[PDB]
Amino acid sequence: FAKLVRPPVQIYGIEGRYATALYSAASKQNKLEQVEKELLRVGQILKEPKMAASLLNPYVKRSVKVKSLSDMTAKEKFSPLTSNLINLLAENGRLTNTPAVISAFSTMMSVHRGEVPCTVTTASALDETTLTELKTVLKSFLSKGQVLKLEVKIDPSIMGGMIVRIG
Amino acid sequence: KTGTAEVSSILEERILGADTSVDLEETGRVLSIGDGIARVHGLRNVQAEEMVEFSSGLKGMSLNLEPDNVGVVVFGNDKLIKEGDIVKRTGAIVDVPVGEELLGRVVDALGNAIDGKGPIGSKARRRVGLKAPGIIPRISVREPMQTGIKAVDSLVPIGRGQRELIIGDRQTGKTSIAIDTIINQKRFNDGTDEKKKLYCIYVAIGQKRSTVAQLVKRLTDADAMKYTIVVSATASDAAPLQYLAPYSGCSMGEYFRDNGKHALIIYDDLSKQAVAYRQMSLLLRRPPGREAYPGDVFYLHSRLLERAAKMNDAFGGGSLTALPVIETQAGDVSAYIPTNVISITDGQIFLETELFYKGIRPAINVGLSVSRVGSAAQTRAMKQVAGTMKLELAQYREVAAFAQFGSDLDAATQQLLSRGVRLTELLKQGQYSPMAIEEQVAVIYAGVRGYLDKLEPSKITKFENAFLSHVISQHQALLGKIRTDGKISEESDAKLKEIVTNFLAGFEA
Amino acid sequence: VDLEETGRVLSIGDGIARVHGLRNVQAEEMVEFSSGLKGMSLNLEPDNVGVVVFGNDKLIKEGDIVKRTGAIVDVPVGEELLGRVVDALGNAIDGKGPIGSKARRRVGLKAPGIIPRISVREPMQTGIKAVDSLVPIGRGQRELIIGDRQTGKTSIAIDTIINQKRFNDGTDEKKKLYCIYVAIGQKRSTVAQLVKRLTDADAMKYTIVVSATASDAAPLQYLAPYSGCSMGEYFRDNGKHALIIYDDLSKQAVAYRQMSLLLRRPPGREAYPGDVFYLHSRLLERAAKMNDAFGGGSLTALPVIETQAGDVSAYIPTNVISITDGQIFLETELFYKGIRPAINVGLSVSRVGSAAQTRAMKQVAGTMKLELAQYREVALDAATQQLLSRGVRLTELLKQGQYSPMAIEEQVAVIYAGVRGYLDKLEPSKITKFENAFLSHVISQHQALLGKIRTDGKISEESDAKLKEIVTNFLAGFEA
Amino acid sequence: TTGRIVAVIGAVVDVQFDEGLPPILNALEVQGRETRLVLEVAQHLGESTVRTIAMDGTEGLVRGQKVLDSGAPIRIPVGPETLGRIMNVIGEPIDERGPIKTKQFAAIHAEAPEFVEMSVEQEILVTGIKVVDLLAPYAKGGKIGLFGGAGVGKTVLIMELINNVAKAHGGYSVFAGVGERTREGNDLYHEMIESGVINLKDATSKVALVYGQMNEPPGARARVALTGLTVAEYFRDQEGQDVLLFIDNIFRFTQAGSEVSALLGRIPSAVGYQPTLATDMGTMQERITTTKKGSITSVQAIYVPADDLTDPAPATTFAHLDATTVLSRAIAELGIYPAVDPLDSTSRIMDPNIVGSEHYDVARGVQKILQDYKSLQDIIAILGMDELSEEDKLTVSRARKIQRFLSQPFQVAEVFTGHLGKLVPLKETIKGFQQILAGEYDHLPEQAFYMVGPIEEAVAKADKLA
């Protein structure tokens, strides 16, 4: 078919199946971020009880719901694909899935471009860098607190077991 | 969801609003193909049961019209297809070309003469989607049809329109039997026996081509092929194709029936089909049930088989006579598919290896061989001697039961055995043994009047040939007559007898 | 709007209502549907409620409002079901209007405690010699009636029930056994005759018939026993002795499995779900012979199992087997022979039957049982030929056909005779004949004695001499 | 409401109904459907989708199609004008004698009488087959389960029974050919018409024919059963008329049900066997009985799937039985017509009371003889035999003789047999066996008992042997 633009982050299926649609869609025309953000915006235009109340509720039993949220709410400026892909997820119920689809996306211009090292000493602050072991020390000026959430406690752990480990 | 359609070429545009494709309703893009089940995306307006055509020239049929896709049974092999592929409807369900320019053909069931003529394709097609006739449309099986196999024609004498199970093991001459009949039909078909203008349909289910090849060669040889379609789904096949074959035939034969003519279908065999189909179901996931078979393997067949019938007048009275075949394994009958078939079939023909070892080809378990139909399937000629004979054999066998303490216990029983044995000699038949009724009754006659019972068993056979050549030679008159009177007429009998006695005298001495 | 106590029928299979909402419903709540049906919010799914529909619909169409009733099920329980044919909801398909039962009690209540419970010591009798004899039986007790079809099976239960007539209609407070016949999947007809029969037989006044006929919706059919159970405890705990005959659990199980499967709550062995032992176990554990706190009362369980070709290896039977305190195994051949009892004795079992029954019977029975063994065993010796003679005599003697229950004393009496070989001095056909005559003879005369024997709870030696003499007189004196 | 075919995956037609839906069971007519293709809503599949069953052929159907709910379940003609009619599931004369213009239509779900509503008592009818009466006597309303092989003469036997009975008994009949062999209906037709059981001179007969042939979609075959069921209740209650209900084959009904269940993407239990196997039956069986207003006596053919009876289906079946005739194939094979099993060709409803106490006793004795005799068979089978003891040998013979005597010729299959059938007066039977019990046929051999009527004729026959 149309060869597909599978630039990871993404999630590979799992509304990576979705995401990757827009990893080829947004991507072509490079509304990648344009739309990446449409979604962000959208999200919370959702997250009020449009969201519970009919949005993820069908009690009407989605059938008319999907034929009224295609048009009462999907009715927006967020629409080059944005509402249309909504209008795709809708029937296809993946509305309940959306945070994750967005997530999947958003991890793209926002974090595709991220960071990740995680040893037992690390637990990266994931800052957005295309290169490595650099920023990774700037971190030491970052270094000034935590329970060693981003990067680790190496105390109870490393070491603490060790005495045990000998006996 | 179904990660299919989450194909981001698929999705990737519904999103966009950049969609519009193959048709996805009258054509589809193969969502996945695997398993000969081409999930073909789209296909909405898609006809049910529709034959589609693949972008491979392979045909498929739209089995499950799922709202998204079609589980499409593939008429080819999917090494010859791939994902995404566009399947365009043919719009139509299966019909198979049907007519008459098939008599003289070995085709694949796709109606392409694999013989090597290529399709001498029928102008017309006739629905495989066609169903069985009604009650009223039918008017009883009465029209005999005799195989030229004395035993058969007598004891499970054969009507027409019928559905009678041929059951027996690994080419226990089974096929041999089928041939002797086929050759036998020749004379009627060489007659212009319009009542017995029996177009033979050989559904070959699963036979590897070489098996077919001798056989067809045989048919060719029997030249019987001339009134014969050989619907051929060989071992090399996709499964549905073997599956399809009967149904195909089914469209075709009912046409003869309904055009007054007489069609004969040999389904050889539904055992393989059933397996295949079941399998097909199973491959389709689509249930199993008992013996792993989907329950509607019955429906499948039942429905298939109701389509063979002996018709009323509207249909020219004709027939589509079914001689279905199931090849037994150890007479396995609670063998679900056998169970079924039995209840459907209007008698069944048991074949037995022992008899076969005995040389008795044909190898029949007579006791079980039954024509539930029975009397309707005969001719008086036969009725007059066969009635007694069958019966006499019944006893003989009963007493073959009771033959081992001395059978010289009462005369009768010794006799029954002697007599029986004589008849036994008669009922074994060579390979390639079509026969004429008058001989058959003649030969029977001899025995049932015990003349052969006054003869050594070895010579019975010997007589039989001789007797045949004798009557053929002289009493051609008479043979003409038994045929003429259509029965053994008392006169013909007297001449016959007289012949017998003399002949017998000549034969024995 | 409650989609948290009420739901809209999301989908309804045809008996499993997937109901959108209901949440706030508590687990295993009876709900009531907008088809007027009842349901149980059995499966609290994280989304919807699998509500087993306690009803028959085509009333339901989706969206139907499913309402809480807000209650975990109880059933009316009482003591007024005696003389009543009921359905499990507590409605009374007897068409005697509605029942007198009125207290309600969770069928969901469980197994008595050990101390609350008090071991069997309490006899249990059927008027069927073979049973009472050869099963030594107490009340509280589970004993499986196992056999295929009323083949007298059902008869069996009846003769017992009928037998209780003399006791319940006797002032045998202790032998005032409330009979609970949970009729599970039985044709209405069967029941009809039955009902009639029992009624004619009137054990029925002291009897509940819980009737879940063949048609009846499966959870109901399923439910009925539990219902019955609650009701029988009602007596039990209330000093009294109820007898529940669970008739039959095979059908219950089936229904139940089916139910499970429809809930797509898995099968198990033989396609039957895993808890199914447990099913009964919990049920039957709720049956008991109590201590004194419960007035010593009992709920005697005669569960019934219908085998399919006597196949018991069968997971569910095995299950049940492993629970029961024995079984009454029935064998066809003897039935078929006309021998009623038809039993396979070997297969009928009481692991330790004797610890809750009666000296009278015991005194003759132990030894007898043994003789029969010997008699039976041997697949001429004067001995053995004798055993055979005896045995055959005794066969007649234990032969009481269908429609034959009795006061015990009558039974012990005749048994005594047989154990004295008195009967061996008779042609076997005439044992039966004799027995009839004899019986009316002692009934006539030695009703005195029988009254006494019944009185002593045992057979007195003294009575024996009188009896011997009686018997002999009758014997001799009607030996022809 | 109108729905759209959203899926036809096979004949499970999922229709999403769009002007709402009615409840389940409501029969839908598919719009655009050539003939009236009724889909019966089977499930509310939810989401205003129903899983429905097509009972017609679905070939060539454009999916996405529009179905218009017929707004109720299927209703079919009722009233006497149906006797001498072959109706298909959907009424529709497959007698094809033109319409059956009836005044009543009925939705095929008929119901069961509450306890109080049904005559709670039985009868004793009889049949004139030695074997039958003796071992399984008759009654009315009673559903008899008949096992064995059609056209062994299982099927024939049914007919023969009909043959005497419908005629003789007034109280109407239903014949349900469920997955009927069309052909068998045809022949039979010419015969019935002929026979004047079916009268066509009068649309009625005494008997209505329902054929729901094999070639129909299972849904249809499955459902043709309710249809017939509905009718008999009509005849009973409404018409008084005490139906004899021939079911051939309830197993074939069942099969259609199971097959369906599967497709219904349900869990059809062990062996594939439908979850609901029982409920289908219960609900059905209870729609049969002697109500106060009559009796629908069932003659229920059950052909045995894979020929096993330990098979749950027959297990179920048993629950509703009133008499069962289990033909023995062994016996049938032994060249015995009737093909009986003498161990569950039964009636619980044989009692000394129900039949003669004698009848019964004689029977018990007989039942015994056979029962014991079988026991010997195994032994004999291994070991030759002769030293068991002679009395037994006598019983053995007697049993065999009895066997042979139970073999009772049949006229309808005289055509085959050459044996003139015999329907036997009760006494001759009772006597028959009693005589045998008296063991009088000393000298007389086994085969002297084969295929006779009254016992004398067997005695006679020994003589004929001589």
Residue with tokens 């008869």: C155
Where on the phi/psi map is residue D462: left (φ > 0), alpha (ψ -120 to 50), or beta? Answer: alpha
Q: Do chains D and C touch (3 or more CB pairs under 8 A)?
A: yes
- Distance, CA of C328 to CA of C143 (rounded, Å): 7
Q: How many beta-carbon pairs under 8 angstroms link A with B?
A: 60
State which amino acid sits at residue D104: Q
Cβ contacts of C91 on chain D, cutoff 8 Å: none
Q: Which of B3, B9, B14 is closest, CB to CB, to A13?
A: B3
Concatenate the DSSP letters of all residues of D146-172 into one string. E-S-TTTTHHHHHHHHHHHHHHHH-S-
| Encoded tokens for D290 | 């002697």
User: Of D130, D143, D181, D400, which residue is the catalytic one?
Assistant: D181
Hey, is D381 helix, strand or coil?
Answer: helix
Closest CA to D338 of D419, D259, D443, D274: D419
CB D128 within 8 A of CB D424: yes
Q: Does domain B379-509 have CATH number 1.20.150.20?
A: yes
- Strand ranges (DSSP E) for D179-276? 207-212, 243-248
Chain B neighbours, 3+ Cβ pairs < 8 A: A, D
CB D239 within 8 A of CB D206: no
Cα torsion D17, D23, D24, D28: sign: negative
| Encoded tokens for C67 | 């309402």
Per the CB < 8 Å rule, is C257 touching D269? yes
| Encoded tokens for A152 | 């680790």
C46 interface with A at CB cutoff 8 Å: no
CB B364 within 8 A of CB B355: yes
- Distance, CA of C407 to CA of B340 (rounded, Å): 55
Contacts of B202 (CB under 8 A, 6+ apart): B178, B219, B228, B229, B230, B231, B232, B265, B266, B268
CB B308 within 8 A of CB B298: no
Q: Which of A21, A24, A81 is closest, CB to CB, to B17?
A: A81
Distance of CA D294 to the CA centre of its chain: 19
CB D187 within 8 A of CB D195: no
Query: D188 to chain B, minimum CA–CA distance in Å?
Result: 10
Q: Where are the alpha helices (DSSP H) in B76-192?
A: 150-155, 174-189
C84 is catalytic: no
Domain ranges of chain D: 1-73, 74-349, 350-466
Question: Which of residues 44 through 103 in chain A touch D, CB cutoff 8 A?
Answer: 61-63
Per the CB < 8 Å rule, is C336 touching D122? no
What kind of fold does domain B23-92 have according to CATH? Elongation Factor Tu (Ef-tu); domain 3 (2.40.30)
What kind of fold does domain A16-107 have according to CATH? Peroxidase; domain 1 (1.10.520)
Contacts of C443 (CB under 8 A, 6+ apart): C410, C450
Which letter, b or e, does each residue of B127-161 get, where b requires 16 or more Cβ atoms within 10 Å of its Cβ?
bbbbbbbbbbbbbbbbbbbbbbbbbbbbbbbbbbb
Peptide bond just before B362 cis, omega within 30 deg: yes
User: Of B286, B372, B380, B483, which residue is the catalytic one?
Assistant: B372
Per the CB < 8 Å rule, is B67 touching D6? yes
Per the CB < 8 Å rule, is D26 touching C58? yes
User: Of C106, C265, C351, C390, which residue is the catalytic one?
Assistant: C351
Cβ contacts of B369 on chain D, cutoff 8 Å: none
Question: Which element (helix H / strand E) includes B253?
Answer: helix B239-258
Concatenate the DSSP letters of all residues of B371-419 into one string. ESSGGGG--HHHHHHHHHHHHHHHHHHHHHTT-SS-SBTBHHHHHHHHH
D47 interface with A at CB cutoff 8 Å: yes
State which amino acid sits at residue B206: G
Cβ contacts of B342 on chain D, cutoff 8 Å: 149
Residue with tokens 């005194």: C363
Instruction: Measure the CA dihedral D34/D38/D42/D46, to 10°.
Output: 50
CATH of C72-357, one of 2.30.290.10, 3.60.10.10, 3.90.1170.50, 3.40.50.300: 3.40.50.300
Q: Where are the alpha helices (DSSP H) in B262-364?
A: 270-283, 296-306, 336-344, 353-357
Cβ contacts of D6 on chain B, cutoff 8 Å: 67
In chain D, which residue's Cα lies nearest the Cα of A91? D47
For residue D18, give the DSSP letter: S
Q: How many beta-carbon pairs under 8 angstroms link B with D?
A: 160
CB D22 within 8 A of CB D69: yes
| Encoded tokens for D57 | 């052929």
Cβ contacts of B67 on chain D, cutoff 8 Å: 6-7, 14, 63
For residue D236, give the DSSP letter: I
Known binding residues of C for Mg(2+): 154, 247
Distance of CA D11 to the CA centre of its chain: 27
CB D347 within 8 A of CB D364: no
User: Long-range pairs for C51-55 at CB < 8 Å and ≥24 separation?
Assistant: C51/C7, C51/C16, C51/C17, C51/C18, C51/C19, C51/C22, C52/C15, C52/C16, C52/C219, C52/C259, C52/C263, C53/C12, C53/C15, C53/C16, C53/C17, C53/C217, C53/C219, C54/C30, C54/C89, C54/C217, C54/C219, C54/C220, C54/C223, C55/C217
Burial label for C459, CB within 10 Å (0-12, 13-18, 19+), is: buried
Per the CB < 8 Å rule, is C192 touching D115? yes
Closest CA to D398 of D334, D357, D456, D444: D444
- Distance, CA of D111 to CA of C424 (rounded, Å): 58
- Name the resolution in angstroms: 7.1
B148 interface with A at CB cutoff 8 Å: no
Method of determination is: cryo-EM
- Distance, CA of C96 to CA of C90 (rounded, Å): 12
- Distance, CA of B445 to CA of B501 (rounded, Å): 11
Domains B23-92 and B379-509 belong to one CATH topology: no
Q: Do chains D and A touch (3 or more CB pairs under 8 A)?
A: yes
Cα torsion B84, B86, B89, B93: sign: negative
| Encoded tokens for B92 | 């139509």
- Distance, CA of B292 to CA of B290 (rounded, Å): 5
B173 annotated ligand-binding residue: yes
CB C375 within 8 A of CB C345: no
Pairing of strands D75-78, D12-17: unpaired
State which amino acid sits at residue A134: L
- Distance, CA of D308 to CA of D83 (rounded, Å): 35
B249 interface with A at CB cutoff 8 Å: no
Architecture of the domain delimited by C358-480: Up-down Bundle (1.20)
Alpha carbon distances (Å) from D83 to A104, C55, D189: 70, 35, 13
Question: Other CB atoms closer than 10 Å to residue C47's CB: what's the count?
Answer: 11
CA angle D15, D21, D25 (to 5 degrees): 80
Query: A15 to chain C, minimum CA–CA distance in Å?
Result: 22
CB C312 within 8 A of CB C321: yes
Q: Which of B49, B336, B374 is closest, CB to CB, to D59?
A: B49
In chain B, which residue's Cα lies nearest the Cα of D272? B289
| Encoded tokens for C21 | 């909402």
Query: D47 to chain A, minimum CA–CA distance in Å?
Result: 6
Query: A70 to chain C, minimum CA–CA distance in Å?
Result: 22
Domain ranges of chain B: 23-92, 93-378, 379-509
- Distance, CA of C464 to CA of C453 (rounded, Å): 9
In sequence order, the β-bridge partners of residue D7 are: D14
Per the CB < 8 Å rule, is A2 touching B9? yes
Peptide bond just before A10 cis, omega within 30 deg: yes
Cβ contacts of A85 on chain B, cutoff 8 Å: 11, 14-16
How many CA atoms within 13 Å lie on the side-chain side of A37?
7
Question: Other CB atoms closer than 10 Å to residue C236's CB: what's the count?
Answer: 30
Residues in chain C: 480
Q: Quote the radius of gyration of chain A (alpha carbons, Å).
A: 21
In chain C, which residue's Cα lies nearest the Cα of D73? C58
State which amino acid sits at residue C455: T
| Encoded tokens for D309 | 């009876």
- Distance, CA of D74 to CA of A123 (rounded, Å): 68
CB D346 within 8 A of CB D366: no
What kind of fold does domain D350-466 have according to CATH? 1.10.1140
Q: Does domain D1-73 have CATH number 2.40.10.170?
A: yes
Q: Where are the alpha helices (DSSP H) in A26-159?
A: 32-47, 50, 86-89, 98-106, 139-142
- Distance, CA of D105 to CA of D79 (rounded, Å): 8
Question: Which of residues 16 through 55 in chain D touch B, CB cutoff 8 A?
Answer: none
Q: Does domain C2-71 have CATH number 3.10.129.10?
A: no
Alpha carbon distances (Å) from C213 to D102, D320, D393, D398: 34, 10, 46, 42
Pairing of strands D207-212, D86-88: parallel
Contacts of B375 (CB under 8 A, 6+ apart): B383, D415, D416
- Strand ranges (DSSP E) for D59-163? 66-72, 75-78, 86-88, 91-93, 104-107, 143-146
Query: B48 to chain A, minimum CA–CA distance in Å?
Result: 25
A18 interface with B at CB cutoff 8 Å: yes
- Distance, CA of C355 to CA of C338 (rounded, Å): 32
Q: Does domain D74-349 have CATH number 3.40.50.300?
A: yes
Cβ contacts of A59 on chain C, cutoff 8 Å: 1, 3, 8, 20-21
Q: Determine the CATH number of domain B93-378.
A: 3.40.50.300
CB D138 within 8 A of CB D127: yes
Q: At what angle do helices C276-285 and C218-236 cross, to 10 degrees?
A: 30
Q: Which of C13, C186, C189 is closest, CB to CB, to D289?
A: C189
- Distance, CA of A53 to CA of A66 (rounded, Å): 14
State which amino acid sits at residue C280: H
CB C235 within 8 A of CB C177: no
- Distance, CA of B217 to CA of B222 (rounded, Å): 8
Instruction: Measure the CA dihedral B253/B255/B259/B263, to 10°.
Output: 0
Hey, is C233 helix, strand or coil?
Answer: helix
For residue D304, give the DSSP letter: P
Q: Which of C18, C85, C261 is closest, CB to CB, to D269?
A: C261
Distance of CA C333 to the CA centre of its chain: 23
Q: At what angle do helices B380-400 and B437-448 cross, to 10 degrees?
A: 50
Peptide bond just before D249 cis, omega within 30 deg: yes
State which amino acid sits at residue B116: G
Hey, is A102 helix, strand or coil?
Answer: helix
In chain D, which residue's Cα lies nearest the Cα of C257? D275
C5, C20, C48, C62, best to mutate vs chain A, most A CBs in 10 Å: C20
